[PDB]
Amino acid sequence: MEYKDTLLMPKTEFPMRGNLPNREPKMQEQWAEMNIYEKVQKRTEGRPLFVLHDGPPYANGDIHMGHALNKILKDFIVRYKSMSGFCAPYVPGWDTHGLPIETALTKNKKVNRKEMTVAEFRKLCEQYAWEQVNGQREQFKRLGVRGDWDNPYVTLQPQYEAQQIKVFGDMAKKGYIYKGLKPVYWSPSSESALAEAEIEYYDKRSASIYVAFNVKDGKGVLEQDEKFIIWTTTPWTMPANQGIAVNPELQYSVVEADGAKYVVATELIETVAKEIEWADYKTLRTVKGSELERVVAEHPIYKRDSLVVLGDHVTTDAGTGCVHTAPGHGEDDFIVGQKYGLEVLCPVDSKGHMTNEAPGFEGLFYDKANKPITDKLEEEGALLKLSFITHSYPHDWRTKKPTIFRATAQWFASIKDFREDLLKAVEKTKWVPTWGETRLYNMVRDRGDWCISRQRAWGVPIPVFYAENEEPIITDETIEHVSNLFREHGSNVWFEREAKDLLPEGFTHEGSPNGRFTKETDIMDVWFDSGSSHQAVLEEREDLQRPADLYLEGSDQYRGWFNSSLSTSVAVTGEAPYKGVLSHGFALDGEGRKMSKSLGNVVIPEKVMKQLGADILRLWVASVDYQADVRVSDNILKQVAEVYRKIRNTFRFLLGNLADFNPTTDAVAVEDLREVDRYMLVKLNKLIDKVKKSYDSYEFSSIYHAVHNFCTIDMSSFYLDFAKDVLYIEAENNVERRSIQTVLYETLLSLTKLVSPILSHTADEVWVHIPNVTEESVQLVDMPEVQEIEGADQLVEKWDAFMELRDEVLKALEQARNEKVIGKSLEAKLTLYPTADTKELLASISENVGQLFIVSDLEVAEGEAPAEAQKFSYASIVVSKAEGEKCERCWVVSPTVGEDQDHPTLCTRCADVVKNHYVQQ
């Protein structure tokens, strides 16, 4: 069809389809060639600092959806702050110590820790961590996250290790760090101790046994015919037994059951009667618990003496009232054991095997030793009832294997001494979400003492020496000298040098007469490694500072990084390491379930960027309420990708219709342009404030919907459809067109900046094509600032009413189309019977209201109720087919067609345009 060449069609090299999986890597390569992170940090050099301290992810395996969610949220804030008058350094980190690196390394080539020196094994661990760090670094940078990826912090760095030593020493000189014997969580699979924060409770099968302890010395309160009934679910602790615990205040009874005399707490007589399946049980004598103290009983197996002891831990809620007591396993057994001087017998190997202190079961795994023990109890007749019951049991954090209690000398951290200062730090830090304040406050007050000793090789050694008299040596001189050595040669010097070589020259200890010294071989828990980041990173580096403004990790870090960082920082500095905390939820599937490999519901970040691209994944992050748990799936991302497509088309339209627009000259003053064009500018400015405030308040979901509605409803539904009849049909320098292009140019420039934090790849793609831009990247400009328009309030009042009318005419047009009256709006004549208020609104409008409704004919009658034709709130509307022939250029139905023999198929406007602007009269 002719006259198609006489239209000003959109023209832009910005493609309709982004092809993000193949385009984004080019953008990322171009960003790196720019050194964009250095450019932004140098442009904002003289700006108030905003420091978001990166929590160190563990350097093992590929990044999961939680890693992408965490890093993308951080990237949003750092990018926004870099464009809002702040200097926003970002130093990503990595946690590179602990058991997981050791276990993965061992089976990588079936290498063994016993075939290599500890120093050699650690060096391979360091190599493995660096390989994992590099893999995660390139995956993170594929997400589009900007940062100092070439100068990260890793916990294996000698400078990091040295600073961690100082943090340990400061807590040591303040009395917070102490050593002592205590039953602690132990993982036989890991052959090292654990902590309550490292223990998860899972259900397991256990043997519930009722054992009989026959009395040896009744001490005038019991006879020898009577026996004590203990109940335990851990038969492997029986070889460690040292006594029977009874509650002093509780009343105990002697029971005649099945021809035997049994001692059981009175309140649990019938409960035990059901369990042991007694027949005709009679109560003989009732006694008080304090009477039973120091009564001598006999161990069923070894026939040694068990001392009846008084303890509060005895409860009538579950059991027999008489509690088997072994100080080696169980803390409540230990406290009462030390009260009476009972021996701390712990006959379990570091690998879970019974040692020489358990005759008849030596060299057996404890779970495999339960049956020989229960059999031995039956042989002597001490076994009363055996029933297997499933119950909650402590388990290892990663190996998911059961953990037992062993009485071993470890190192601990006393939160109690400075617990008040922790509380003041909990309230002084802003918490988003708000309930996090209560979560950490209850954690601090209910906290016990933090065990910090691990019997592993890969980690930071405990910088403690021992003299000849076996006394711990922790002075400020020793801590400082160790820290300097770790700074110079790393933590491996602790395992390749003698203890005398790790102390200052000429070091003398009053407990060491011959100058002989020994060194601790334990290492710190990795929660101490990651918790010292505020000292080794925030305060060590020039580009950062302490406290950091923000700490952004998941909700699982209230027990971890949020807690460990506070404990060390308050201990050493007296204040919190963060000015505020932001917490996000976990990533779930579409069904709302946790992702697991067995179910196959895991969404891999690598596959999302291979199939959809990073920008979509970031747009998903902005679309969800991160502060609670979120969902993501193939269908959920497809919905986001459709939204991203709508936004991208909005950008392409702006660029396409600005191809002939010079912002330096062709721009129209806001006063001089039209009201409807000025109305869109006000809406743009309303959008600018909402997005910036939503960025400030960290409400990114609001940004997601605000831009989505602006692109779909405000721009494409009304303004872009309305602008087609001017941008395409009218002359290039038509005053109405230049006013439209001016609003489009303003909309394009501001919207590109607004979405730069989130759609980082697309924003720079749009930015290059924007006319009259003089910066390399949109990241190098500040956010748009709201401008107030003269008479904005009156302008909004008038045109908000017009939009109400426009919605009503749109419904009427849709109904008319459904009744086969018109195929499109241009084929329609709209006659309006309005209210007097509606009429005065239409008289105040100087624009072609028919063109604003995209119709060929608009009539406002003098006033007469029609024959029941589309009654609406503002007016009654009749939709008629327009009269005349259709112009072959703008497809309007007007009688003006054919009034000029030159171009006899065109209307007056289109004939003039070709005559005067393509032929020039």
Place this chain on the structure above:
Amino acid sequence: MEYKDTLLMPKTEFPMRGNLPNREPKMQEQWAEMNIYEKVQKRTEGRPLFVLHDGPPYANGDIHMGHALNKILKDFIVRYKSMSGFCAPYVPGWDTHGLPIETALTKNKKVNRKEMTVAEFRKLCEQYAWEQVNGQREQFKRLGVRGDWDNPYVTLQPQYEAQQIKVFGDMAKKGYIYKGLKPVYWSPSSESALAEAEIEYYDKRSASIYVAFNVKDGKGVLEQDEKFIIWTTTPWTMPANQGIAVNPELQYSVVEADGAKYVVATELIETVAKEIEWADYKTLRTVKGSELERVVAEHPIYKRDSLVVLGDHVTTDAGTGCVHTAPGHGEDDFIVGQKYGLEVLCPVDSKGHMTNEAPGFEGLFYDKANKPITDKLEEEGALLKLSFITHSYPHDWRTKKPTIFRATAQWFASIKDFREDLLKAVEKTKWVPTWGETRLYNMVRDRGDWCISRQRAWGVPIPVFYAENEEPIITDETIEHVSNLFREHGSNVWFEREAKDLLPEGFTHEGSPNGRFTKETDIMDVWFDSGSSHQAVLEEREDLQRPADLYLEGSDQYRGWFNSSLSTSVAVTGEAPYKGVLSHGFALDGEGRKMSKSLGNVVIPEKVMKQLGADILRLWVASVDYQADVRVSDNILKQVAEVYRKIRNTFRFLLGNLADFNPTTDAVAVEDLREVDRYMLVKLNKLIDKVKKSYDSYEFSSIYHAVHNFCTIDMSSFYLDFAKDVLYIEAENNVERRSIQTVLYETLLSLTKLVSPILSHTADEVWVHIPNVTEESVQLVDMPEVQEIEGADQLVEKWDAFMELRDEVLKALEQARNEKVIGKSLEAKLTLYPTADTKELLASISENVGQLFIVSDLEVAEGEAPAEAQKFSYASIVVSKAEGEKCERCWVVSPTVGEDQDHPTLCTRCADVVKNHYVQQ
């Protein structure tokens, strides 16, 4: 002949605009005359029984959103079951006994109880209660909820009271009912005892004091110059002190602080030192709490003995380690008080005023007595610290005024004697959400005995007689006789006649040799009234049975109706009253804040029904995940109205285009149906399966989204989009048109039946206009069943690919019109450059794909795609202007237009249709 007169436009009496506020009442009047509930119950009288027992709402005021949510949720299940092969009797209830109704007549109306008897006053209470029942009944009926509204149950009914008396008697017979002197919640405003279910915790500002108790005799452990420090926020409990409670296994230290020696717990010394603001405090000695048992302390005011007592309840979490023990104002104080034989002193009366047992403070309100006590304490030199704090405090359920603890003789139900049976009953019940099992399991395990006696007038009497020896009389003979009298005369007979006339004719009790008897005046707890509804309704009504299938109430009923109904039912029957329980959350506003008259964020069902209609509110209930707290505002409902309009438009299209369709003659069998038509039937069968399975799982939001998507993307956007061309233009008996009408008629029947439980008003509105229908209402038919379609897997495999192709085609068409290439899809030629798979798909479709794309021309090219082509996954598409002339009838652009000289403006198809069917026969 006008060409528009030759189009088969839709014709139906179903209005486009619902006008639900003005038309739903007419529907409800039509239901009322039908006796639709009676008809449904009779139609299904042989069907198996499903019982959803209605929880009785209090009849005091208008219904709120929680009520509307509850009933509509109940109405969903009862309606669905009645259509799913069950008999579903729904019997609404009302709780009519209670203090709020008693208070309203006393205060709001001009009723003085001096002028009338108690029985006459209760008659007024019944009259006021009935008015509220009638008011709520109409409001509930306006929601559209079906049920036996004309024969409901109320707690004041003589039969209801007769069975409640039976419940008391059976529990009393089993020994679960007793009268005892124990501390209970007491409301001074109501002058009555209370229960934790009738307690609301509010913030209260009280005075926090620290009081020194001098030591009278240290018994070799303490010294005469040493003192106990106690902490309390209730100074009015000081006159009732009897001793100092300590924890037997906590360590207590004698601390000399600012020239005074005090006894506090070791772990609380620093906390105490901060509150009293001690300057110099030193720990002198240390003893365990067990050693302090014999110590006798001095009461600060009255100088009487204060026995140090040992108690497990004494905690180190707040105040000092020493708690002042008043057995008459606390549960834990009473337990230890009985252990040591302490006097149960309650110097406060039922009106909250200090009695003579508190010399120096007699006649004062407890709040007004705190200041004199603290002043006297300071004058005696025992007040170490006075502070004012704000903390959560128990308040009255009705008056919203703070309560106190008073030791009084009340009636209790001993849960402890059958708590094992309750817990087993909880585990044999299904809970949705599942966590509701944990809530009741923990509540039953951790609860005390239930105080069931109230000192009010409006409620069921406690059916106990007392003899001359003042011993209680509860026998099966007396309980049945009272129950018979209550069934024939009502509960007022207890307040009208005397005790002798309330006993059996010949009654002999050894405790009344003279024959004189007395009757208890206390009434039952309103929770007992509601908690007996299983015996008083399910076992009494012959259309119901016990156990009920389902209890459906809010999350506030785990302590309320669910617990009390379980407690009475398990006591009397040994089983739970319900097979399963469904819990819903509370209704919030758009921001998620609780509704409040202060904020003005309350959504009133009465207004919603007057401005939007019940069906919108019913549609919102299905729209939310009711099993947790939900949100609703005017904007939220307006969003739901948009969804309703789409659904109503879908129904209006089906009715309009089935005007000429008679199923008896014009139906096309599935074998003779087209593939795309059978493909729609396959998708319809999938809708049937998911919707019915979602009703069975109580997952209504699934039905909400499934129906919305089916009407919008599967029907309005896809099937109805190309059905218009056949339906409006082709001949009436055209087989393609009949095939579409067959699918529409099948969908119209299934859709109306599926949505009947939710959009009840609109489903019956559509059902009347459905062609060739015999049943009076949609409620009187069963749900549609899923029928297999041959080749469904192959049908879905193909046409799903076609649907995805069409969406890409639609995206291409939308882009073309935005570039002024076309104005309408009918003005376009589609040129497709398909992939290899797409080429196969388009060859396997026997239908006119160009017709299915609503275009005038389609061309699948074999050449390379041009550079300007729109790239997509399935194909590269070029949208051009269709060649030819537009047909005046069907608006298609074909070269065949202008061939028929009899119809110069018609294409070949339209010209033949007019000539063979509209000009001729």
